[PDB]
Design brief:
part of a larger assembly, 4 chains, A mainly alpha (about 90), B mainly alpha (about 55), C mainly alpha (about 650), D mainly alpha (about 475), A: about 90 residues, mainly alpha, elongated, B: mainly alpha, about 0% strand, binds 1,2-Distearoyl-sn-glycerophosphoethanolamine, NADH dehydrogenase [ubiquinone] 1 beta subcomplex subunit 9 (chain B), mitochondrion inner membrane (chain C), NADHpl_OxRdtase_5_subgr (chain C), NADH-ubiquinone oxidoreductase chain 5 (chain C), respiratory chain (chain C)
Chain lengths: ~90, ~55, ~650, ~475
């Protein structure tokens, strides 16, 4: 059902706390959307595999390309940091 | 007695030469194989601890 | 309506129709039939496997799905799955109808059938689980049920101490299995079978060594490789159908199975396959020497187990794991037979010794089980007539399989292993059947009664060892492999050396006849050579000194309690808080307490003089060099 | 209306005709279970603090309606799972101790019910002031509960509580003072927003960290815990509430997100080593120790040590595995302590092991409730715990692979507890006891069975009341 409007978290000056909560709610929803896209990728990959038999290189590679591209991304939300003055790692 | 104890302990060391790791183990003995495969449990009266039980 | 869930859930009812038991007998004639009807429908499925579909049983549930993983209770029944399940159903069924008349008298005799039936349930969900998670569920259930199960009795040493060093040595595999599973979830997403087979096309084609050697630690722990293998000998001393499941088809066999459902990634890591080769190469010889020496017939068959899987570890080390799968099936059908055979002959003798030195006549004094275990022993000696010719002598061909070089050594290794495998069966068979009557107990045919329809367990498995070798001719065949174009054992099947390919069985016949020739001339057991042979047989009789683990466990339990000794040094960070304060109290109350009942003015007056002098002098110390902070620290020397 | 329960307080005043004051004290918590269950029908989505109550009443004495809300602000959030850990355990203590009241007095039940409500308010707290005023208000009730009603040297036992868990507590007072004097506000549910710069974001982390080091113990002091567990007074809350009192992992999760967005300077070089060598050393301390309760007290230390490396993982798997250990250990371990206290201490009055061995031969089904429950403490292939320490090892391996590569030996050292314990518990002689009594007391069977089913029914992991990474991650 319902579709809350995303707020663009970096734009609202951090006192209007309902907007801040709706921003972090929306950002976490966007995280879950890219996650569910990754789930779509895996459900496609299993069907390609069990149709393929031994046919990895035929038509199942190009799933695995953006699969192992998308997997180190699309995981966490954290917080959009203020200034990023000190990097590490 | 000196030579007797000498030969007796010499044959004792000779006996330890032929220690054997895997003995006969008759089954009832504490060697293990039949040893208490099911203990017959002794039957005693139950002693209820709590008053309200 | 005869769906795949009836292949599983029926066995589950074996637990549930025995949890609400209230039935002192009759659980045999219900539950064993309840396993039989699982066994035959799994056979119907295996006959249905002409078409080779895959019944996925996926939405049993969804276990969890939070970020980048979705463990589902997934159940696909593969061609690799069915070989092991048609093993374990058959072996378990025959153990069930073997366990009826045997073990009839107990203080509790329903728990036995119930536990081994629900063990068969967790073994079959171990095999049919279509991921790594349910793989772990079965692979952990079987060990912690084996804690309860090989300790079916409540005795002192041979079970109750023994169950710990069984399950804890399983647990050493459990922990590094969980570690490798964590490396799976860092590297891969789904943690299943399906996605993981597609992802052998890695990021940068990295190490992956810590994926698989972590599970190969479990493949040491389960399937009893030489790093820790004493626990088969130590969990031997349960009752004998427990040892039947322990060595033939279920317990020791999953250690190859998690290698087999991970056969994709073995094909992309030769650096683990090399140690996979040489560890099993060590175990074949170790098992050979120990089952030469130690004179417990259950130990002889129990070490024959790890011998016969050592070259399966070599076979997966040589990528021809179809041969490993077939050999696991054949070995399961072997030690299905020989265990219940040995249990029958133990049951018939009044003493019920597990020795060999006290038997003498398995001649016409008791001839039937001799014929059965003769079939099973010729089965062990890779004899040309039956599936022993098939289950071996193709692995030993694969040792010569020369797509690998520095590989000629393990041919001789397995060759020595097969010679020693023959002298196992000859060592037990002469000393049971053709030797002179050893123990004069049960003299006047008191063991002449042969057990109770135990023929009917043994006869079906004897058929499945004699002429099930023609059936399952897998060695140009599909059978759901992965096979990454390294070796494929094609050159191993075609034209090895005839002075090597034919010698492996001619030497078997020669060594069998030679150990039979120890009857007419008796000097192998003789000659009592202290400085050489006695100590050699002693050091090979104590499991190649596997009790050096007692310089690894009980030599570190003391260190584990030096940790306790340290933890009391932490109380030495709290005891003195109730002791050094209890010296501080007497030190603070002793100062300015010279007279302290009379004359208390003078103490206090000199004290406040010292107050104003010390404080003004320390103000002078302050405003010249504030770094000098000993004048307070010397005042803390008092209290 | 207002006095609809003060009239029920008149019912409580007249209810002391029947002089037990116990059955009403059980029916009160039984109604509290439903009063939390209807409350579980509200926290739907949107991940904000759903209910609200001020309860310190800046412009009242007991109300919540103001514009200058200088009050305590006690309310619910995604903490509610721990609350759903709590209210099904609070009667389950008392019913586990219903018989062996040890008739010095009845007020024992009032103490246990009191701290049962107090840690509910701990979970219902929001502010640093509010969380601190409940986070040690347990401790006088704990002290009276150890001092009277204990078995061993209570003068040795009770003082270790108000030494240590007051010590780390008033160290936490430093960090609460400093962040209440920087912010001049403490609404931790409403402030995941601070320009707190590092090097003074660091020492407040130290002041919180050694506090929670004391509460969920680590190798600087963990002797705090097992002697409280040794002299464990009166089965129901001898352990069980002081076992849920070390669910100050709610502190490390509720705090340490919203103003420690920069604490990776001390995340991996401090917490992981101090966790890992607890899971090695303190779990290795259960070999020679002979008290029957100390060997599972150290198991509790080990499970919480697994859980906190799950906490500090910055991965949503680690947080969720930590929370599900927080419910899972709080299921399995109160059951084990109710075993050793309620129906195994009371049968024998002795807690050593050396002449205690030998069961299954006159108490049959006791051992069947022993071995699966000890497996549920072992790690257990199904969910008694498993997915807890599984996902915790996942997050711990993600954040740092080497210390997780040692930390997977937790499962070995978890086996070292119970599988040394159980076989030298069920070894069939029993030649120093006199074959005591019935094992299940038919209500002790209920109290063990409810926690057993509550462990096992977490197989399908229910994460519905936890948007897990709501506020605990970093970029
Ligand atoms: C007003 C404050 C005092 C409230 C007293 C309780 C109201 C009456 C409820 C009751 O009847 O409790 C019964 C019990 C005494 O029962 P009885 O057996 O008849 O007498 C003792 C035997 N010689 O009486 C009790 O149970 C004692 C009351 C328990 C609460 C005491 C808390 C002690 C520790 C203090 C911690 C910090 C204070 C927390 C503040 C809580 C405020 C509600």
């Amino acid at each position: 059902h319902q579709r809350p409007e995303l707020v663009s978290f970096d734009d609202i000056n951090y006192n209007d706390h309902k907007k801040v909560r709706e921003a972090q709610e929306s950002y976490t929803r966007e995280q879950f959307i890219r996650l569910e896209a990754l789930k779509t990728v895996r459900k496609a990959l299993e069907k390609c595999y069990e149709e393929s038999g031994p046919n990895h290189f035929e038509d199942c590679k190009n799933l695995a390309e953006q699969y192992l591209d998308m997997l180190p991304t699309h995981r966490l939300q954290g917080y959009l940091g203020y200034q990023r003055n000190d990097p590490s790692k | 007695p000196r030579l007797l104890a000498r030969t007796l302990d010499e044959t004792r060391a000779h006996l330890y030469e032929f220690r054997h790791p895997d003995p006969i183990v008759p089954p009832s003995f504490p060697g293990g194989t039949k040893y208490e495969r099911n203990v017959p449990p002794r039957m005693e009266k139950i002693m209820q601890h709590n008053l309200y039980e | 309506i005869s769906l795949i869930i009836i292949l599983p859930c029926i066995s589950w009812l074996f637990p549930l129709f025995f949890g609400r038991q209230l039935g002192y007998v009759f659980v045999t004639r219900m539950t064993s039939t309840l396993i039989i009807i699982t066994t035959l429908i799994t056979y119907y499925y295996f006959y249905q496997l002409l078409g080779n579909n895959n019944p996925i049983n996926l939405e049993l549930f969804n276990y969890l799905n939070i970020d980048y993983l979705d463990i589902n209770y997934n159940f696909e029944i593969d061609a690799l799955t069915i070989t092991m399940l048609l093993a374990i159903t058959t072996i378990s069924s025959m153990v069930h109808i073997y366990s009826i008349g045997y073990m009839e008298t107990d203080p509790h005799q329903v728990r036995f059938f119930s536990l081994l039936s629900m063990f068969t349930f967790w073994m079959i969900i171990l095999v049919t689980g279509s991921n790594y998670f349910v793989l772990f569920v079965g692979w952990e259930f079987i060990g912690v049920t084996s804690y309860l199960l090989i300790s079916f009795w409540v005795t002192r040493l041979q079970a109750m101490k023994s169950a710990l060093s069984a399950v804890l040595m399983n647990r050493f595999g459990d922990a590094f299995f969980v570690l490798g599973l964590c490396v799976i979830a860092y590297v891969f997403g789904t943690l299943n079978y399906s996605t993981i087979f597609a992802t052998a096309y890695l990021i940068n084609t990295d190490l992956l060594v810590l994926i698989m050697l972590a599970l190969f630690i479990a493949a040491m722990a389960k399937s009893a490789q030489f790093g820790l293998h004493n626990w088969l000998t130590l969990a031997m001393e349960g009752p004998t159908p427990v040892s039947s499941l322990l060595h033939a088809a279920t317990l020791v066999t999953a250690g190859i199975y998690l290698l087999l459902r991970s056969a994709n990634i073995l094909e992309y890591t030769p650096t683990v396959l090399f140690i996979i080769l040489w560890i099993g190469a060590l175990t074949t010889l170790s098992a050979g020497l120990i089952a030469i020496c130690s004179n417990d017939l259950k130990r002889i068959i129990a070490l024959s187990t790890m011998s016969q899987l050592g070259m399966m570890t070599i076979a997966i080390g040589l990528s021809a794991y179809n041969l490993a799968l077939f050999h696991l099936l054949g070995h399961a059908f072997f030690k299905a037979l020989l265990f219940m055979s040995a249990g029958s002959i133990i049951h018939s003798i009044l003493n019920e010794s597990q020795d060999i030195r006290t038997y003498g006549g398995l001649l016409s004094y008791l001839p039937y089980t001799y014929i059965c275990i003769t079939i099973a022993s010729l089965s062990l000696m890779a004899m040309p007539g039956l599936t022993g010719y098939y289950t071996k002598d193709i692995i030993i061909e694969s040792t010569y399989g020369s797509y690998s070089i520095s590989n000629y050594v393990v041919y001789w290794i397995a060759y020595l292993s097969a010679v020693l495998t023959c002298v196992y069966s000859m060592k037990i068979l002469y000393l049971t059947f053709y030797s002179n009557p050893n123990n004069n107990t049960i003299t006047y045919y008191n063991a002449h009664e042969s057990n109770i329809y135990i023929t009917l367990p043994m006869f079906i498995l004897a058929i499945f060892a004699m002429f099930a070798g023609w059936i399952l001719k897998d060695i140009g065949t599909h059978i759901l492999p992965n096979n990454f174009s390294y070796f494929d054992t094609e050159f191993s099947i075609t034209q090895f050396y005839k002075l090597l390919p034919l010698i492996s069985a001619i030497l078997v016949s020669i060594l069998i006849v030679v150990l039979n020739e120890f009857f007419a001339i008796v000097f192998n057991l003789n000659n009592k050579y202290i400085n050489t042979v006695y100590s050699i047989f002693n050091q090979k009789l104590v499991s190649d000194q596997i009790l050096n683990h007692f310089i690894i466990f009980k030599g570190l339990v003391t260190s584990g309690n030096i940790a306790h000794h340290v933890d009391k040094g932490s109380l030495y960070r709290l005891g003195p808080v109730g002791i050094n304060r209890l010296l501080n109290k007497a030190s603070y109350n002793v100062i300015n307490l010279s007279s302290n009942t009379r004359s208390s003015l003078s103490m206090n007056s000199m004290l406040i003089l010292i107050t104003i002098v010390s404080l003004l002098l320390l103000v002078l110390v302050m405003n010249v060099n504030f770094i000098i902070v000993i004048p307070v620290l010397i005042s803390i020397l008092y209290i | 209306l207002l006095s609809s329960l003060y009239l029920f307080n008149r019912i409580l005043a007249w209810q002391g005709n029947v002089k037990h004051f116990y059955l009403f004290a059980s029916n009160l918590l039984l109604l509290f279970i439903v009063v939390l269950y209807i409350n579980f029908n509200t926290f739907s989505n949107s991940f904000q603090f759903n209910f609200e109550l001020f309860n310190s009443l800046n412009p009242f004495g007991l109300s919540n309606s103001d514009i200058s809300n200088g009050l305590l602000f006690g309310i619910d959030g995604l903490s509610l799972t721990f609350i759903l850990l709590t209210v099904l355990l609070i009667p389950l203590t008392l019913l586990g101790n219903w018989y062996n009241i040890n008739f010095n007095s009845n007020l024992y039940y009032t103490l246990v019910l009191a701290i049962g409500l107090v840690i509910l308010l701990n979970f219902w707290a929001l502010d640093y002031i509010s969380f601190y005023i409940l986070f040690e208000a347990t401790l006088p009730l704990l002290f009276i509960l150890i001092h009277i009603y204990g078995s061993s040297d209570s003068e040795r036992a009770s003082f270790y509580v108000l030494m240590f868990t007051l010590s780390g507590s008033l160290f936490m007072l430093l960090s609460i003072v400093v962040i209440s004097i920087v912010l001049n506000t403490t609404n931790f549910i409403n402030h995941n927003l601070f320009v707190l710069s590092l090097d003074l974001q660091t020492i407040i982390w130290l002041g919180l960290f050694i506090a929670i080091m004391v509460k969920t113990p680590l190798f600087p002091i963990h002797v705090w815990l097992p002697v409280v567990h040794s002299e464990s007074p009166l089965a129901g809350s001898m352990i069980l509430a002081g076992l849920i009192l070390k669910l100050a992992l709610y502190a490390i999760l509720r705090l340490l997100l919203p103003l420690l967005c920069e604490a990776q300077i001390l995340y991996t070089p401090m917490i992981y080593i101090i966790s890992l060598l607890t899971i090695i050393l303190t779990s290795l301390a259960t070999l020679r120790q002979i008290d029957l309760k100390v060997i599972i007290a150290y198991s509790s230390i080990s499970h919480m040590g697994i859980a906190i490396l799950g906490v500090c993982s910055n991965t949503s798997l680690g947080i969720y595995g930590s929370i599900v250990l927080g419910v899972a250990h709080g299921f399995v371990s109160p059951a084990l302590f109710l075993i050793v206290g309620g129906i195994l201490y009371d049968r024998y009055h002795i807690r050593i092991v050396n002449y205690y061995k030998g069961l299954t031969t006159y108490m049959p089904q006791l051992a069947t409730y022993i071995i699966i429950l000890s497996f549920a403490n072992i790690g257990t292939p199904l969910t008694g715990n498993f997915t807890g320490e599984f996902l915790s090892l996942q997050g711990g391996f993600i954040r740092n692979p080497i210390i997780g590569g040692i930390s997977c030996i937790s499962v070995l050292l978890a086996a070292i507890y119970q599988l040394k314990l159980t076989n030298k518990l069920t070894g069939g002689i029993s030649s120093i006891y006199m074959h005591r009594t019935n094992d299940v007391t038919i209500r002790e069977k209920f109290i063990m069975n409810i926690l057993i089913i509550s462990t096992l029914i977490i197989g399908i992991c229910p994460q519905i009341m936890y948007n897990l990474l709501y506020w605990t991650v970093n970029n």
